[PDB]
Design an enzyme around this catalytic site. Structure first.
Site, mmCIF file in Angstrom:
data_model
loop_
_atom_site.group_PDB
_atom_site.id
_atom_site.type_symbol
_atom_site.label_atom_id
_atom_site.label_comp_id
_atom_site.label_asym_id
_atom_site.label_seq_id
_atom_site.Cartn_x
_atom_site.Cartn_y
_atom_site.Cartn_z
ATOM 1 C CG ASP A 84 24.762 -11.706 1.523
ATOM 2 O OD1 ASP A 84 24.322 -13.023 1.537
ATOM 3 O OD2 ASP A 84 24.904 -11.355 0.665
ATOM 4 C CG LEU A 117 -2.319 -0.761 0.838
ATOM 5 C CD1 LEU A 117 -2.188 -1.978 -0.142
ATOM 6 C CD2 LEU A 117 -3.180 -1.069 2.108
ATOM 7 C CB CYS A 118 4.264 1.961 -0.007
ATOM 8 S SG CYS A 118 4.719 2.094 1.921
ATOM 9 C CG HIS A 119 0.744 6.538 -2.382
ATOM 10 N ND1 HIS A 119 0.484 6.080 -0.854
ATOM 11 C CD2 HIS A 119 -0.608 6.761 -2.499
ATOM 12 C CE1 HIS A 119 -0.960 6.438 -0.664
ATOM 13 N NE2 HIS A 119 -1.462 6.601 -1.814
ATOM 14 C CG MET A 160 5.759 2.954 5.716
ATOM 15 S SD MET A 160 6.057 2.379 7.202
ATOM 16 C CE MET A 160 6.912 0.558 6.695
ATOM 17 C CD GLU A 161 8.496 5.716 1.415
ATOM 18 O OE1 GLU A 161 8.188 6.420 2.424
ATOM 19 O OE2 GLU A 161 7.612 5.308 0.698
#
Lengths: 145, 145, 145, 145, 145, 145
Positions: D114, D63-65, D99-100
């Site tokens: 990693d 749901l992120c734009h 969120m980014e």
């Protein structure tokens, strides 16, 4: 370490970049393509589509590039006796130019041509002594208010 | 145009090496060597861009097949006014990996260009001296044993 | 940096289980269990995001290899003030899948955060009660053939 | 579930800073600072992965734009037995970028994992000393215009 | 073929609605309604697949432009032997969003098919009764005020 | 919740899936395409490339699909008086069939055609009363040892 460049405070201006590059090929291959006799498919149409898509994927491919609202892309070809020159023009109204997008489109279009003609370009030994991509450069970078 | 069938072929070890160069101002090559490029670690960025590009090859080149890449090495050679990038790709599959190696070398070079654009451009914001050239397949190998 | 060669290794069953938690207001945890989050189905969205992320691991983590993932399971466990996510990844291949499981669990946790951001934020629009913690590999299974 | 409408809102400066830590053997932390990790440049790889991840946020979180990100900075802070990562994202837009920033910090932390997996693993090939913790939003800035 | 220039156009509110149906066995529609499909939450999955697809439109359709999507709504209507999906897309930009809405509706339908394949197939593993149909643009709107 | 299907233990067998679908168009449009008079570009070549690329992106688009080593893809067209029918055949030697990949290729190819002819298909009111995608189905799914 790496440091991405901030562009938020810059003005939104018209930006255009034109890049060119060429792929050296056997003369017969150039003819086959020119006549549309390459079994694998429509060489030029495939290259244009690959290049246009590539322009839009530039920010995913080049680590420090920014997402840009590209407004237009044109990819054209010029035939030589033993080469095909691709020109990619990218345009946008934004805060940072589109030369990396133009170079990416040109290079992927050239890679696409190579892939499409690999069968006729390789030698009896399966190597590529006649094929190469060269003179990939930015013809011009426009930034206007 | 169609994605050529390769399913019936034998699974053999495949290796491909591609090389390419980016012409830069001698002062730019020095800044890189010295880790003085403001945008960041040029070589590490080019290496990562190239490695990710190899894995992205089937998404960028229309008729390329998805391939279980088993290894990728990207190395550099410094010239007075250029940097030569070498990309070696390996896989145990049904179709060679030259396009993957060329894609990796190409994007690595583009990433170098992006990382250095600020010192390569001229007072007019153009790139009169920068270019990518001699992008070619050094060798394509296939082994059974 | 270079994508380590794994082509020579044997294809064996591989499984990895990763876990992680997202701290939330017990109020939020409540809405979730009851399915009152207006943005939608939090758990389903988290599972789908995590599964997709597992498959995206090779393009997110530079040196990870393309892997033929054969299965992925993402489950939840509720706490008074948190939600624990477990991601299990399986494959028959030449290189373990712990990074894939870690990627799936982290993206699942991030999806939950996105889904409940509106109720987790405080009066100042900050997130003083929200956080992702103890993300670890519960177990890594690698058959010696 | 539905991607909430933000089209009517004003375009304002937005910034978010997220932080997170990865617990490691103090030995590993040592190798990193000295640059002795044979797999490569851990920090540069982490920064590049995080920056790319920021741009991939809309395809990772359902749901992120799509957001015109204008800048991203990823920095590190060393501890006796851990490495703290900070990700700052900026943009002029209609919806914040927390969120980014969270996505960038988490992928950066996963990239470090990693990169040092071979030295972090124990005799049984497990990760009893490794974990990602306290991933949170340090601050969310949203100009009221 | 070229990506048509749209940069000179005005930025106006754009909205597009697309609808489509997937013909399913009546028993399948019931299992969905009742949340009895083993593969999972069919509707939530279709919604997410569709929303992510909208954002992926420029990567899938060659000549489509990258667009700052501001909202997406995906809804369902149940028939006796079908499910109709409606995708509404909105943006404040220079080029409409019908292709984005069609892409969203299409992938949502494909996701439903994937989620239900086990109960839709016949004893011969075929899909004699399943199909996607009547995929069309319900309306395309553009407003200035 | 959702539950992806495990496929690791299944046998590697030859798999082929053929899907078909059609796009209803104005008769004049069909003629224009058939004669290659669509200004925007080579309609059929663009659709084939879009469909082939789409097949390879199926696992990114359909949440619970697995990454598959696709070995071949063929996309062909059939002309009707007021429609164009696209056929997509996908092949692979793997542990799970390729019908979802075939459907994805067919649908994206149809969406690509739509995008390429939007200018001539829309009515005086800018709507699409003559265009629609229909009868998208799996013709056959083969799974042989």
């Amino acid at each position: 370490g790496v440091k991405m460049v901030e562009i938020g405070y810059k003005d939104v201006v018209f930006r255009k970049a034109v890049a060119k590059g060429r792929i050296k090929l056997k003369p017969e291959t150039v003819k086959l393509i020119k006549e549309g006799k390459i079994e694998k498919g429509n060489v030029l149409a495939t290259a244009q589509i690959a290049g246009i898509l590539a322009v839009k994927r530039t920010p995913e491919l080049i680590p420090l590039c920014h997402p840009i609202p590209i407004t237009g892309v044109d990819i054209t070809f010029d035939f030589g006796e033993d080469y095909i020159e691709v020109t990619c023009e990218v345009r946008a109204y934004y805060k940072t130019g589109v030369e990396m997008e133009a170079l990416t489109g040109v290079t992927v279009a050239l890679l696409a041509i190579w892939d499409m003609v690999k069968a006729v370009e390789k030698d009896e030994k399966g190597q590529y002594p006649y094929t190469r991509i060269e003179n990939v450069h930015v013809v011009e970078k426009v930034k206007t208010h």
